[PDB]
Every structure is written in C-alpha cells, then in structure tokens.
Design a protein around this nucleic acid. Structure first.
Ligand SMILES: [Mg+2]
Ligand SMILES: [Mg+2]
Lengths: 48, 99, 134
RNA sequence: AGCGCCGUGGCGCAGUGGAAGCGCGCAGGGCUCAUAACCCUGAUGUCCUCGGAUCGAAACCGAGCGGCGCUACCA
C-alpha cells in the first residue's frame, strides 16, 4: 500500500513514442518513494 | 536520403503558444509560455525528427492537465503565423520575435 | 536663536511651490524591433526629444556601450546584431540614470556643452558645472 | 596655454610625392549530394577644412577645425 504523492506522465523509450500515465507514490510500510504505472486506458482520472 | 500557404492553427482549451528559450538534449527543450511560465516542452512523435526546430521559433504547445510544469509540442510555425498572430495580438506584446 | 531660520525656510518652500508645481516621467517606452539578423529602433528620435538630448551623442553613447555596428535610417537606428529589447532598454536606462537626470537632485533640463576639449555638462534650472565626459 | 600623434571604406595598418590601397568585415558566386574548410568577384572614400610651388597632389608646406598624450595649472 502507498499514497499517491502526485501524478506524472513518463515518456516511453526510443522506438516507441508515447507518454504513459504514472503516479509518484509514497509507500506506507517503509517510507520509501517509488513510481507506478496505471493500466486500463482511462484510469489516471480515477486516481484522485 | 531525400527519396526514401497552409491554414494557421489557433490555441484552444488547454493549449497555447510558447517561445523556445533554450534547446535541451535528447529531444527536450524549454519554452517560455505566454502564461507566466518557463515550462519544459517534450517533442512528440510523428514530429520528433519530422520537423526541425530552433531557438527563437513560436511553438504551439499542448499542456498536461495532470502535470502543470511539463508540456509537449504539437506544432511549429514558419515565422509567418507568428507575425500574423502578433498583429492580432494573440500572444502578449511583451514577447517580440522576428527575423 | 533659530527663529529667523524657519521663516526663510518658509520663503524657500513658497518659492519651490511657485516655481515647480509638478513637485523621470517622460521616458518613451523603447518599443524596438528584433528582425533576427537585424534590429530597428524607431523610438530613438522620441527618446531624443523627451529627454532633451541631441541624437548623435546618444547614438554614439549607445555604440560605445555595445560593440555593434549598423547605420541610422528613416529617424531610426538600424543595428544588425542580436539584442533583446530588454537589454537595449537597460542601456537606455543607464544613460537616463547618469546623463539626462543628475543623481543628487531631480532635474533634466541640462544639456551638452563644450567648456579644454571635452564635453563639460552645465544645467539651466540650477547652473551646475560637472565634468562628465566618459 | 605650448609641445608630441592623427585625420577611413565598417574597422586596423599603411604608400603617402601618378591619383585609390592591403588584411578584417559584408553582399555575391565557385568546389561538395550537402555543410563547414577552401577558391574567385566585388561597392564603400570630401584619405579632416581652407590656400600655395608643382602637368598635377591626398602626399610637399603653411592661416583653420576636430579628436588623441604629455608639459601641468602655466597671476
Ligand atoms: Mg518518391
Ligand atoms: Mg511526446
């Protein structure tokens, strides 16, 4: 489990041009911060 | 290598004009946007190495409603639409570019 | 006894209110043109007038600040170099700060004069003699 | 105030006693598929003013101007 610190769009690698919706999230259990992809096309607006 | 007047485009609903300040690396750039921001612009595909840009070129930039400090280019003008929109003053007069 | 000091102070203040009711606010906005390789400044004559400054001395001072070359065309200055309007505005600000208006008191009516070969400034509202040439 | 220097083509040097110079700049062309490098052609002048010997001076000199460094404040 974690808390969404904010929402970002991270750009794809070289042979594929697109931006993938990801979330900068702070983990509850240990305090470390990480980034997370969100599948399922229309779901960044679900994140809140 | 090579053998292998269009209508101007206007800003709308989360999209505006920008002035490239410095050219970054790896296909990045910085644009002073006509909103009060020194935003960073990423170059989109079908346009990355399709149209060539340079510092001093008015840029049509789409924004990120989920990320306000980042934006990405959609279109570059060949210095004519810039003078045009300047005459109609779409972009504030405080930013003057000509060549 | 400082009583006869305040009365002549009052006399001076009435003199000031009589002579100078307005007590710069007359700097034309330097609207420039940066045509890439070229630069055209039309306001050069207006800033010459509203500051009571002769054109040739102003343009040579501009050329002395920045080592760029061009010509003078027409009532305008055509310099082929790269400068934002902000920086030429700044140069005009420096010239305004140190030439048109004296640092010590607010005045502007002073102009160029040649007092034994340089340009020695004198005023009209006051009668100053300051050796400002470079 | 006097003496040492000077009088651009945008610049710096120059031959300054035949009458327009060289490089740096700028416009244009050439080579290259193309760019830079390289190669060619250029238009710019009161060579500061006024007079004088001189066929003739920009040059040789002087009856004035302007800008530079010293003598140094030269009642
Ligand atoms: Mg084909
Ligand atoms: Mg993109």
């Amino acid at each position: 489990k974690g808390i969404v610190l904010e929402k970002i769009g991270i750009e794809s690698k070289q042979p594929n041009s697109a931006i993938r919706k990801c979330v900068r999230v702070q983990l509850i259990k240990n305090g470390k911060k990480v980034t997370a992809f969100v599948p399922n096309d229309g779901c960044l607006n679900f994140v809140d | 290598k090579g053998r292998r007047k269009r209508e101007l485009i206007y800003k709308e609903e989360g999209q505006e004009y920008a002035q490239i300040t410095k050219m970054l690396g790896n296909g990045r750039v910085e644009a002073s946007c006509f909103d009060g921001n020194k935003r960073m612009a990423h170059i989109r595909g079908k346009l990355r190495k399709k149209v060539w840009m340079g510092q001093g070129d008015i840029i049509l930039v789409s924004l990120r409603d989920f990320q306000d400090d980042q934006c990405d280019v959609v279109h570059k003008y060949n210095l004519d639409e810039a003078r045009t929109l300047k005459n109609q003053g779409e972009l504030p007069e405080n930013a003057k570019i000509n060549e | 006894v400082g009583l006869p000091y305040s009365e002549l102070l009052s006399r001076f203040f009435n003199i000031l209110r009589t002579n100078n009711p307005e007590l710069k606010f007359r700097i034309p906005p330097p609207v420039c043109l940066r045509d890439g390789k070229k630069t055209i400044f039309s306001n050069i004559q207006d800033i010459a007038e509203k500051l009571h400054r002769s054109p040739e001395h102003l343009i040579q001072y501009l050329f002395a600040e920045l080592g760029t070359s061009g010509s003078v065309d027409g009532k305008r200055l055509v310099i082929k170099g790269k400068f934002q309007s902000k920086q030429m505005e700044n140069v005009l600000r420096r010239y305004i700060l140190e030439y048109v208006t004296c640092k010590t008191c607010k005045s502007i009516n002073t102009e160029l004069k040649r007092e034994n070969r340089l340009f020695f400034m004198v005023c009209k509202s006051c009668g100053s003699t300051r050796s400002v040439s470079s």
